[PDB]
C-alpha cells in the first residue's frame, strides 16, 4: 500500500521537475545581460538609534516610512521616530525571548513573539496614555519566528511547530492553519495584496499559501540549508529567499522555479535577512559576517556593502516610500542608511 | 525645534533614563540555560519557557529551559550552559554524548562554557555493583581502561573522560567544560554553578583585556 503511494509520489515529483524544465527556455541572466549595470551605490548611515541594551532580533517599519519598532533581548520594544531619533514608546514585555516584531499598517497595534509561543498585540493609540496588551494569541506548539499584520483584526504567524497560522485578534483564535512544512518555518512574507503569502522553513523549501483557502499552492525547493529570510518582489509575482548556504535565490511564482542565484566566492556566512528596494532592483541581504550586501536583483552582482555593525546583522528593513534602509545587529544598535 | 519637538525630546530622555535603570537591574543577574533530553533529572539539580530563580552568595541566578537546532542562537550571551546527563542508563548514553558534541561544537556557543552534571551517580553505583549490566557491552574501550569502591569509581571516571574528551577536541580555549558528579539528594549544586561562574567570569574579564 504505502509502496504504491510512495511510487506515485516519485512519479509526481518527476512530472513536476519535467514540467519546470520545459518552461526554462532562456535564463534571466541571459535576458538581463543587455541592461545598464547599476554600478556602485555608496549608502552611508544617517542615523544611529541607540538605547537597546541587548541584541536586536527583529524590527519593522511603519506604513508612513517615519516610525519603526525594534525588539531586543532586554525584553523591550522601542518605537522610534526615525527622523529625529526620539523614542516614541517603550513597551516592556512579559517574556524577553523575542524573535519577531510587527507594526500594524494602521499603526494602532504592534506584535512581538518568540520562545514563549505567544503572539502579543499591543494597543498604542489608547486613552490612559500607555501601551497595554490587547490580546495574547496562543496555540502554536513552538516558538514564533515571524508575524505580519493583514489588518487590525488579522495576523499571520510562522512558528517552529512546522506550522503557520492565521488569527482573528478580536476572538483570539486560529481561523486557519497552514500545514505542509517539515522544518521550522523561519521567515514569513505577506504579499502586497494580502491574499497570498510565502514562507521559508528549515527544510530548504519555500511554500506559497492562499490566505483564504488555506492551501499550499506551490512549493519551491532549491536551497541546500535552512532558509532564514523571505521577501516578495514588489510586483507580487516573485520572491527572494536567503539561506545558511550563503546564497540568496529569486523564485518566480508563475514560472514556478528559481530565477537567479546571488552568491560570491568570498561569502561563506549564512544570510539573515532579505529586503528589496521600491523598484525591486536592489536586494539588501544581511549576513552573519557583520555587514550587509546590495545585490543587483537582475544582474546578480554586489553593487555595494553596508559595513557599520560590529556584530551580525540580524534584521533589515526598507521603507514603503523607499528613502531609507534599516539594519539591526546583535551590537544593540540599529542604523538608518540612505 | 518646536515646543512639541522639545517636549518629545524630553519624553525620549525619560525613556532613556528608565532604559538604563532596567539595564542595570538586568545586569545584576546571571543568565543560565538548562539542557538535557529527558529522564535526566533536569528539574532537581537546584532543589514553553520555564524560568527559575535562585541566589547563592548574594548573586542572582536565572535559569531557563524549553518545552534546539535553531533557537540556541538566542542563548549566545548566557553566562553558562548547564548540561545534564543520566549516567545510570548506558543504553542511550551515546545519544547524550552525541548531543554534547552537538552543543559543544555549535557555532553560536563557541565562547559559552558548559557545566556538566552527571545525575544519578547514586544509581550508577547500584548498576555497577549489581553486575547485571556492563559498560563493555556498549563502550568497547572500557575493558582496556584503568583509573589514573574501586570499580564504580573507575566507571564514573570513564564516563567523565568521554565527555571531557569531546570537550577538549575543538574547544580552542575560548570556552571550557566543568564536570560534576551529582545526585538527586545532593544540595551543593548551586555552589558548584557559583564557583564555575566565578571561573567563567574571570576568563571573560581577562578576555575583554586582550590577555586570555
Amino acid at each position, epitope marked *: 500500500e504505502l509502496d504504491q503511494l510512495r511510487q506515485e509520489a516519485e512519479q509526481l515529483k518527476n512530472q513536476i521537475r519535467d514540467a519546470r524544465k520545459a518552461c526554462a527556455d532562456a535564463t534571466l541572466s541571459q535576458i538581463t545581460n543587455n541592461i545598464d549595470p547599476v554600478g556602485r551605490i555608496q549608502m552611508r548611515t544617517r542615523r544611529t538609534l541607540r538605547g537597546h541594551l541587548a541584541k536586536i532580533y527583529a524590527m519593522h517599519w511603519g506604513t508612513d516610512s517615519r*516610525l519603526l519598532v525594534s525588539a531586543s533581548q532586554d525584553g523591550k520594544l522601542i518605537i522610534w*521616530d526615525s527622523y529625529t531619533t526620539n523614542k516614541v514608546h517603550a513597551i516592556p514585555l512579559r517574556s524577553s525571548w523575542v524573535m519577531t516584531c510587527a507594526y500594524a499598517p494602521s499603526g494602532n497595534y504592534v506584535a512581538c513573539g518568540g520562545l514563549d509561543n505567544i503572539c502579543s498585540i499591543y494597543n498604542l493609540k489608547t486613552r490612559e496614555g500607555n501601551v497595554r496588551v490587547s490580546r495574547e494569541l496562543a496555540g502554536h506548539t513552538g516558538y514564533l519566528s515571524c508575524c505580519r499584520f493583514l489588518d487590525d483584526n488579522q495576523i499571520v504567524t510562522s512558528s517552529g511547530d512546522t506550522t503557520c497560522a492565521l488569527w482573528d485578534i478580536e476572538t483570539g483564535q486560529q481561523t486557519t492553519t497552514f500545514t505542509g512544512h517539515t522544518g521550522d518555518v523561519m521567515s514569513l512574507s505577506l504579499a502586497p495584496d494580502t491574499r497570498l503569502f510565502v514562507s521559508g522553513a528549515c527544510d530548504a523549501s519555500a511554500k506559497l499559501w492562499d490566505v483564504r483557502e488555506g492551501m499550499c499552492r506551490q512549493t519551491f525547493t532549491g536551497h541546500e540549508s535552512d532558509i532564514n529570510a523571505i521577501c516578495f518582489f514588489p510586483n507580487g509575482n516573485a520572491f527572494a529567499t536567503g539561506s545558511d548556504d550563503a546564497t540568496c535565490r529569486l523564485f518566480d511564482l508563475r514560472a514556478d522555479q528559481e530565477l537567479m542565484t546571488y552568491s560570491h566566492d568570498n561569502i561563506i556566512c549564512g544570510i539573515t535577512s532579505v529586503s528589496f528596494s521600491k523598484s525591486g532592483r536592489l536586494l539588501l541581504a544581511g549576513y552573519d559576517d557583520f555587514n550587509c550586501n546590495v545585490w543587483d536583483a537582475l544582474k546578480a552582482d554586489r553593487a555595494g556593502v553596508l559595513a557599520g555593525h560590529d556584530n551580525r546583522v540580524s534584521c533589515l528593513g526598507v521603507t514603503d516610500d523607499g528613502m531609507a534602509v534599516a539594519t539591526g545587529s546583535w551590537d544593540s544598535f540599529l542604523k538608518i542608511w540612505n | 525645534v*518646536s515646543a512639541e*519637538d522639545k*517636549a518629545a525630546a*524630553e519624553r525620549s530622555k525619560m525613556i532613556d533614563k528608565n532604559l538604563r535603570e532596567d539595564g542595570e537591574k538586568a545586569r545584576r543577574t546571571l543568565r543560565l540555560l538548562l539542557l538535557g533530553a529527558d529522564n535526566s533529572g533536569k528539574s532537581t539539580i537546584v532543589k514553553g519557557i520555564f524560568e527559575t530563580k535562585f541566589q547563592v552568595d548574594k548573586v542572582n541566578f536565572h535559569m531557563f529551559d524549553v518545552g534546539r537546532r535553531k533557537w540556541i542562537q538566542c542563548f549566545n550571551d548566557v553566562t553558562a550552559i548547564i548540561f545534564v546527563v543520566d549516567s545510570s542508563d548506558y543504553n542511550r548514553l551515546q545519544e547524550a554524548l552525541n548531543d554534547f558534541k552537538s552543543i559543544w561544537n555549535n557555532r553560536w556557543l563557541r565562547t559559552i562554557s558548559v557545566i556538566l552534571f552527571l545525575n544519578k551517580q547514586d544509581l550508577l553505583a547500584e548498576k555497577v555493583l549489581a553486575g547485571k549490566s556492563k559498560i563493555e557491552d556498549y563502550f568497547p574501550e572500557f575493558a582496556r581502561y584503568t583509573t589514573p569502591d574501586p570499580r564504580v569509581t573507575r566507571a564514573k571516571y570513564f564516563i567523565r573522560k568521554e565527555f571531557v574528551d569531546i570537550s577538549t577536541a575543538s574547544g580552542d580555549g575560548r570556552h571550557i567544560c566543568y564536570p560534576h558528579f551529582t545526585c538527586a539528594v545532593d544540595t551543593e549544586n548551586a555552589r558548584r554553578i557559583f564557583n564555575d561562574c566565578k571561573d567563567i567570569i574571570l576568563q571573560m574579564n581577562l578576555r575583554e583585556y586582550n590577555l586570555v
Partner: single-chain antibody
Framework: VQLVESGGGLVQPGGSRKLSCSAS????????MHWVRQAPEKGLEWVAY????????YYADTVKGRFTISRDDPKNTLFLQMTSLRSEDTAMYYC??????????????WGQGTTLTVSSDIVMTQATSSVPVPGESVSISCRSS???????????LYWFLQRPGQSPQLLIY???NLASGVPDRFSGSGSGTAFTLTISRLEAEDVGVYYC?????????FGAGTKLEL
C-alpha cells in the same frame, strides 16, 4: 479619565491659595499638565505648565513670579500655589493634560474647573465673535501674528469647543487631525496666518464657543472666541 479640581472661593486681594487637581484613570506621570483659566465673561488664557517628570516649568507673564505649579506623581495630584492674588485673577481655572510624542494629541482632556473669585507673543484673531446659525454648514476662521508652519512640516493650530456650562473639548490638533471621538463632519484647513474650521450638518449639542490655540512657541495664546448660536 478624570481630572477633578479643587480649591476655589472668595479670596481677599493680596491673599494666597492653592488649587489642587486630582487625576484618576490615566497614567498621570507620563502627561504634561497645563493650567488654563477663563475669566467670568472672557476667553481662555494660559497660566502655567508642568512637564512630565516636572523637568520643565513655564508660566505666563501675568502670573510669572507670583504663581507656582508643581505635581505630586505618587499621589496623582496637580497643584497650583499662588500668592498675592489680584482682581485680574478671577477665573475658572481648568486643569489640562497634554502628552508630547510623535503623532500625539495634546490638550485632549480638560477637567471641570473650580471658580476662584478675588474680591514677542503670537496673537490669535477670531473676528466673528458670534455667528448665528441646524442641519447647515458653518466656517470658523482664525489668524496668527506669525506663520504657525514650522520647518518640520507641522502647523500648530488647535480647535476647542466649549459647550455652555462645560469644560472645553479638543476638536482639531495641528490644523488637520480630528480627535478621538469628534464626529467626522468637522475638518480644519488653512496655511500660515490663514486658518479655518468648517462644519457640515450642524446639530444639537454642537453649538458653543470655538477657540483657536497656537502651540508653536510659548506663551500659548488663544483667540477671542467665535460663538455659534441656534
Amino acid at each position: 479619565v478624570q481630572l477633578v479640581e479643587s480649591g476655589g472661593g472668595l479670596v481677599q486681594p493680596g491673599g494666597s491659595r492653592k488649587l489642587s487637581c486630582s487625576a484618576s484613570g490615566f497614567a498621570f506621570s507620563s502627561f504634561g499638565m497645563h493650567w488654563v483659566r477663563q475669566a467670568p465673561e472672557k476667553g481662555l488664557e494660559w497660566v502655567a505648565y508642568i512637564s512630565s517628570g516636572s523637568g520643565t516649568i513655564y508660566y505666563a507673564d501675568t502670573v510669572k513670579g507670583r504663581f507656582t505649579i508643581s505635581r505630586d506623581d505618587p499621589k496623582n495630584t496637580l497643584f497650583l500655589q499662588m500668592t498675592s492674588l489680584r482682581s485680574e485673577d478671577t477665573a475658572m481655572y481648568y486643569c489640562v493634560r497634554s502628552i508630547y510624542y510623535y503623532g500625539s494629541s495634546p490638550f485632549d482632556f480638560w477637567g471641570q474647573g473650580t471658580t476662584l473669585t478675588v474680591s514677542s507673543d503670537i496673537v490669535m484673531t477670531q473676528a466673528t465673535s458670534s455667528v448665528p446659525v441646524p442641519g447647515e454648514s458653518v466656517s470658523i476662521s482664525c489668524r496668527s501674528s506669525k506663520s504657525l508652519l514650522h520647518s518640520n512640516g507641522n502647523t500648530y493650530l488647535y480647535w476647542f469647543l466649549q459647550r455652555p456650562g462645560q469644560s472645553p473639548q479638543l476638536l482639531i490638533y495641528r490644523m488637520s487631525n480630528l480627535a478621538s471621538g469628534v464626529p467626522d463632519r468637522f475638518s480644519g484647513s488653512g496655511s500660515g496666518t490663514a486658518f479655518t474650521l468648517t462644519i457640515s450638518r450642524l446639530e444639537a449639542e454642537d453649538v458653543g464657543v470655538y477657540y483657536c490655540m497656537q502651540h508653536l512657541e510659548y506663551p500659548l495664546t488663544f483667540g477671542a472666541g467665535t460663538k455659534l448660536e441656534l
